[PDB]
C-alpha cells in the first residue's frame, strides 16, 4: 500500500479531446500560437491550436479535456524560471507563451 504527502489527488475522452478542440475560436484573420499542455492528470500530453487566447480558455480547455479536472483546483506554470501563470486572464501574447509548454500543477 501507499503513504501520504503534501500534494493533492474511460477512453471516451477522444470525444472529450474532440469537444475540447471544437470548443475553440480561431480567428482566421488572427495570428496563431500553439501550446503544449502538460496535464497534471498524469503524463497527459496536450496539443493546442490557440491563436492569441487567454488563460481562462486554457482552463476551460483542460476542463473540456479531462472530467476530473472539471472540479479540481490547480494553477498553470512556466518551468525554468518556474513562474506560475498568475493572472489567468491575459492573452498568450502578453505572457510570452507563444509556442510554449504550460505544465499543470494541482494546488
Amino acid at each position: 500500500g501507499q503513504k501520504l504527502g503534501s500534494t493533492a489527488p474511460p477512453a471516451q475522452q477522444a470525444e472529450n479531446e474532440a469537444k475540447a478542440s471544437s470548443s475553440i475560436l480561431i480567428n482566421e484573420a488572427e495570428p496563431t500560437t500553439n501550446i503544449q499542455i502538460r496535464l497534471a492528470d498524469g503524463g497527459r500530453l496536450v496539443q493546442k491550436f490557440n491563436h492569441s487566447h487567454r488563460i481562462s480558455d486554457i482552463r476551460l480547455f483542460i476542463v473540456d479535456a479531462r472530467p476530473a479536472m472539471a472540479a479540481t483546483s490547480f494553477v498553470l506554470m512556466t518551468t525554468f524560471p518556474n513562474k506560475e501563470l498568475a493572472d489567468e486572464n491575459q492573452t498568450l501574447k502578453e505572457a510570452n507563451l507563444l509556442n510554449a509548454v504550460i505544465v499543470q500543477r494541482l494546488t
Partner: protein
Amino acid sequence: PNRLIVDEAINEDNSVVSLSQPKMDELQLFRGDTVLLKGKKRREAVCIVLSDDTCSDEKIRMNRVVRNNLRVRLGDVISIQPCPDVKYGKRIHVLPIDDTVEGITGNLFEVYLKPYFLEAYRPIRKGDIFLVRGGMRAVEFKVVETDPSPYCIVAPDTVIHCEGEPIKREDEEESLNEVGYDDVGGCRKQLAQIKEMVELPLRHPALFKAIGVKPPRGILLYGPPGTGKTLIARAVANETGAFFFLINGPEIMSKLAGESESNLRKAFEEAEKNAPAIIFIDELDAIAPKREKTHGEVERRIVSQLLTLMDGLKQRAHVIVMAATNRPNSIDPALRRFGRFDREVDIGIPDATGRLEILQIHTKNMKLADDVDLEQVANETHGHVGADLAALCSEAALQAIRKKMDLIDLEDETIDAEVMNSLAVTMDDFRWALSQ
C-alpha cells in the same frame, strides 16, 4: 536531423539546453519541450529545451553536466530529438558517489535531492549523473533506478529513494570536480584566442597529418600571479579531452644538476605518448630567466635543454606547450623564436565586471544570505585578481563558520550535512573579510 554543435551554457541549470527561436521553429519544439539528446557510445539524456538569442542556429548551449553524460566536448554534434513519451515518475533510486560525500553525514535527501527537484519537473534518464550544489560543496548523484523506466520527469508525486550505500566513480565517468571553462571568469577575449589556437591541433589531429600548414606549438601566458593561468591551461586540457602534463618550475630546479634535465626530457617523452597533450610549464621564469638572470653553468644547461626539447617537437605527435610567467622581461628571449613560444596571450587583472563573475564562481557551493551584494563586493576590490577573490570568499565562509560554530554545533567529530547547509554567509562576512 538538424544535428547541432555543442557550445557554452548560459543559465547554470543543468536540465536546460538552448537553441535559437529559428532553430526551434523548424521542428515545432516549443519553449519548454522535454527534448531527447543522443550522442557518443551508448549515451542519451533528456533535457528541457528553452531558447536563446545569442545562440547560433546550428549550436546548442548546454552545460558540462549534460555534455559528460552525452560523453562529448564543446564542438561535437548531437541529434536533438523531441521526446514525447516522457511521463511523470513514480519512484527513482539514486545514490551519492563516494568521493563527493566523504566528509558529510546525515540525510542527503533533505539537503540536496529535495530542494533540487522540488516543484522543478526535472526530466532524468537512467545512469545519468547530476550535480547538486550546497553545504559548501557539490555532491554528485547517480540515477540507478526509475519507474517509469529509461527516463521520467520527477514530479511532486515521484518517490525518491536514497538507499544506504555510496557507489564508486567509474573511470569512464569524469568528475564535475575537474576544471572546466565554467570555472574561469573575466577572461573572455584571451580565453577566446586560446580555444581558437588549440582547437584544430588538439581537436582535429588528423588534419595536420594531411596538410602542410604549421600549427601553433607553444603558447606563452603572461599576467601577474593568481590570474588563472594554471587554471586556464588545465581547463583547456579537460575541455578538449587532451592529455595534461604539469611541469612546475621549482620542482625542476630543486633536483640535482642532471636529474633536472632528465625530467624535462622524460616529461616531453610521456606527453608524446598520450597526445594530443598539453604540457603546462608553471613558473617558466624559474627554469629559463632572461640572459643576465643566470649565474651558473647548470642553470644554463637546463634552459638550453628546454629549448631543444621544443625544437625536437615535430608535427607528428602533436602536443601543445603552454608556459606561464609574470611578464616578458622574466623569460629568456630564445624561448620566443619561431618554433617555440611564438604565441603569447596576456591575461591581466579582472575589472569590476570580471571580478563579479569570479565571485559567483567561488560561491556556487555556498549559501549566500539575501543581504549579500556581490556586485558591491566586486566594486571595492580594484587591484584584486582571481586568487584574491577566491580566497576572499574562503575567508567570508570561514568567518561565518567561526560565528555559528561556538554554538557547539557537533564540530570536531566527522561532519553532518544539514548542519553545513544552514550556515549562510552574510554580507557582514564579506565585510569582515575585506577589512583583512
